[PDB]
Amino acid sequence: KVFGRCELAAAMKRHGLDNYRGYSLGNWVCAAKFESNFNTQATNRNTDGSTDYGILQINSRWWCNDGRTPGSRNLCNIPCSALLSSDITASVNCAKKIVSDGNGMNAWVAWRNRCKGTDVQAWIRGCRL
């Protein structure tokens, strides 16, 4: 499923992402906008044997189990394909696990690159929240 900027804002908000670990709602819409394009079915295949999955692009070597990624941990207890459905629960759930440990949304390269220290309050402007 491919989200529209506000229904993704409203959905991420449904799921308690607004202000989770000190990052406002727009910080998330932004990472997801630049990582996948609100495309929950996106898949990228890095160098190292890992692959990135869904709307947020979570990495198979720390976070999920697709079983073809060595050096695999399974910190989210999730198959990487649960990350590609249309409901963002699994992805939100695995996003909180990530962000929680100790680096923050710095975990996401695209937020680092294109959202970090920018007026992110502008990816939620307009939306009923």
Domain boundaries in the chain? 1-129
Q: Identify the DSSP state of 82.
A: G
d(Cα 101, Cα 98) in Å, to the nearest integer? 6
Tell me how far CA of residue 74 lies from CA of 11, 59, 62, 127, in angstroms: 25, 10, 6, 35
Is 87 marked as a binding-site residue?
no
Looking at the chain, which runs of residues are DSSP E strands? 43-44, 52-53, 58-59, 64-65, 78-79
Judge residue 79's burial from the number of C-beta atoms within 10 Å of its C-beta, 0-12 exposed, 13-18 middle, 19 or more buried: middle
Residues marked active site are found at: 35, 52
Residue identified by tokens 């495309």 is 39
The experimental method is: X-ray
In terms of DSSP bridges, do strands 52-53 and 58-59 run parallel, antiparallel, or are they unpaired?
antiparallel
For the 1-129 domain, the top CATH level (class) is: mainly alpha
Question: Is the distance from CB of 86 to CB of 55 less than 8 angstroms?
Answer: no
Tell me how far CA of residue 69 lies from CA of 23, 97, 113, 123, in angstroms: 30, 20, 26, 34
Query: Nominal resolution in Å?
Result: 2.5
